[PDB]
Amino acid sequence: YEHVTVIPNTVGVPYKTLVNRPGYSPMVLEMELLSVTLEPTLSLDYITC
Amino acid sequence: YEHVTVIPNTVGVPYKTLVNRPGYSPMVLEMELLSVTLEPTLSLDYITCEYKTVIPSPYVKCCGTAECKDKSLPDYSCKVFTGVYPFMWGGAYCFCDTENTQLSEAHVEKSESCKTEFASAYRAHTASASAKLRVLYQGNNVTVSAYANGDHAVTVKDAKFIVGPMSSAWTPFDNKIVVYKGDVYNMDYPPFGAGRPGQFGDIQSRTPESEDVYANTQLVLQRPSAGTVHVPYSQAPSGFKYWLKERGASLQHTAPFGCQIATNPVRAMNCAVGNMPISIDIPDAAFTRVVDAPSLTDMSCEVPACTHSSDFGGVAIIKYAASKKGKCAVHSMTNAVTIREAEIEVEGNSQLQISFSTALASAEFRVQVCSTQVHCAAECHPPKDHIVNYPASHTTLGVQDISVTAMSWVQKITGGVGLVVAVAALILIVVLCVSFSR
C-alpha cells in the first residue's frame, strides 16, 4: 500500500506521518534523515606544490 | 412453495434473490449462471473439398482420325487434335509424319482426402437454449443443469427448478453457415449444382460418402506441344484450396455479445444478451416461522470505508441485539447497492460486518436483517486504476436520477433563483391587483 509525504531537509530530526488505508486501522510512520550528502563533479585544472 | 424471478443473462456474475413467504422468516438465495448454450438444428446442404482432375493416357491413332465419344462424368471434356507427331524415347510413335490424331479426354472427381479434409455447409434454422446454474441453498453450493426452454423442471436438494424461456431469440449464426474444424462462418454459399469456378463450392456433393458430384471448374483441353505425348489443359484452381487461404476470421473471434463458439455439436456459449426467467418450487422444510426465528432490535450501522471498485470495495458494520442464538438472512432494498454476504450468525448483543459494491458516490441503502431494517449511508472514493479483468458486481448508475450528497448545491442555486422568480411574480401580482382596483 503506497503512501507519499515530504519532510524538511534537516538531519537528525525525526518527522511523523499517518498511514491512512481506507477500511483498515491506521498506523504511524516516523522517519529521520541520518545524513544527506552532496558530491560535486570535479574536473582537475592543475596540481601545485 | 414456488418463487419466480428474473436475472441478467451474464455468465459468471452472482445474483441475490429474496424469498419473502408471508408469516415465515425471509430467505435469500444466491444464484449464478455457470454457462448458457445455444445449439442450432442443422440440416446439411452439401460438402465442399478439393477435386482431382483425372486424365487417362491419351489415345493416339496412327494414320487416321480418332472418334470423339461422349459420356456423362462430373465435368467431362474431350477433344481430337490433328496433325500430331509424337516421339517416345526410341523414335516416332506413328508410321508417318502426317495424318495422325490424338484423342485427349478428362474429367473431375472428389480427392480421396474429401472424407477427412472438407468444409461442410449447413442451413441452421432454430436453436435450443441450455443452461448450467449454481445456487447457494441452505449453505451448500449446489449445481443444476437444464434446458432453458421454460418447460422441463429439474430437482436437486429436494428443490425443483424450472428455467427460461429465454427472453431474446438472438443468436450469432445466420440461416446459412459453414464449418471447417473448430471454426464456423456466416456466409451465403452458392446453391447445390450452381457453384462458380475458382470460388467456394466449385465442387459439391451431398455427403462425404456420396457417389454423386457436381463440379464446374471450366476445364479446357489444349493442343499438345508438337512432339510430346502429354495432355495440357487450363482449369480454375480449387475454390476450396483458395478459401482455406482467404477464410478471414471465424465467428469465435468476431461475434458480438462476447460469444464463444465450438463444434460437434455446434454451440454458441455464454452470450451476454437479454435476461433469464428462473422459478424454484422450494420444499416446506427450509421455512422457519417468523415467531421461531431470531429477531433483532436496536440495531444501527457504520460504513468505515467505501470505493466504486466493482468487486465489493465497500465495507459496513451493524451493531445489534437479538432474542436468541441462530442463523439470520440479509438483503439490500436498494438495487443500486449489492451486498456480498447472504446469511450470518446472530446472538445476544454484538455487531456483524458485511461487504457491498456500488457505482454511487454517496451510498445510501436499507439493509434488511431477518424481518427488520437498518438505514445505512456514507461517502465513497473513486478507485485509482482505470481498468480491471472482471465485470462489475452491481448494476449501472441511475445517471440522471441519483447523485452525490452535495447535490445540495443544486437545491441552493435552484432554491435561490426559484425564490427570486416567485418574489418577482408576487410583487407583479400586487401592482396588477392595485391597477385593477382603480
Hunting for cell 429477531 — which residue is that? B295
Residue among B248, B250, B244, B234 nearest B197 (CA): B234
Contacts of B307 in chain A (CB under 8 A): 22
Residue among B314, B303, B310, B312 nearest B385 (CA): B310
Report the gap between the CA of B304 and the closest CA in chain A (Å). Answer: 6
Contacts of B304 in chain A (CB under 8 A): 22-23
Which long-range contacts link B333-337 to residues 24+ away (Cβ below 8 Å)? B333/B365, B333/B366, B333/B367, B333/B368, B333/B373, B334/B364, B334/B365, B334/B366, B335/B395, B336/B360, B336/B365, B336/B394, B336/B395, B336/B397, B336/B398, B336/B402, B337/B363, B337/B365, B337/B394
Question: What distance in Å separates the CA atoms of residue B284 and residue B21, rounded to the nearest whole number?
Answer: 11
Contacts of B305 in chain A (CB under 8 A): 22-23
**DSSP letter assigned to residue A41:** P
B304 in A contact zone (CB under 8 Å):
yes
Neighbours of B281 (CB within 10 A): 15
User: What residue in A sits closest to B355 (Cα-Cα)?
Assistant: A23
| Torsion angles phi and psi, residue B429, rounded to 5 | -65, -35
Neighbours of B272 (CB within 10 A): 16
Residue among B204, B206, B201 nearest B239 (CA): B201
Find residues 1-40 of chain A whose CB sits inside 8 Å of chain B.
22-23
Neighbours of B192 (CB within 10 A): 14
What kind of experiment solved this structure? cryo-EM
Counting one residue from A and one from B, how many pairs have CB atoms under 8 Å apart? 8
Contacts of A23 in chain B (CB under 8 A): 304-305, 315
Report the gap between the CA of A7 and the closest CA in chain B (Å). Answer: 25
CA atoms within 13 A on the CB side of B268: 27
**Do the chains contact at B381 and A23, CB–CB below 8 Å?**
no
For chain A, first and last CA: distance in Å?
58
Residue B152 in grid coordinates:
422441463
Contacts of B381 in chain A (CB under 8 A): 22
Q: Return the HEC string of chain B.
A: CEEEEEEECCCCCCEEEEECCCCECCEEEEEEEEEEEEEEEEEEEEEECCEEEECCCCEEECCCCCCCCCCCCCCCEEEEEECCCCEECCEECCCCCCCCEEEEEEEEEECCCCCCCCEEEEEEEEEEEEEEEEEEECCEEEEEEEECCCCCCEEECCEEEEECCCCCCCCCCCCEEEECCCCEECCCCCCCCCCCCCCCCCEEECCCCCCCCEECCCCEECCCCCCCCCCCEECCCCHHHHHHHHCCCCHHHHCCCCCEEECCCCEEECCCCCEEEEEEECCHHHCCECCCCCCEEEEEEEEEECECCCCCCEEEEEEEEECCCEEEEEEECCCCEEECCCEEEECCEEEEEEEEEECCCEEEEEEEECCEEEEEEEECECCCCCCCCCCCCCCCCCCCCCCCCCCHHHHHHHHHHHHHHHHHHHHHHHHHHHHHCC
**Is-contact B107 B74, C-beta < 8 A?**
yes
At B185, which amino acid appears? Y
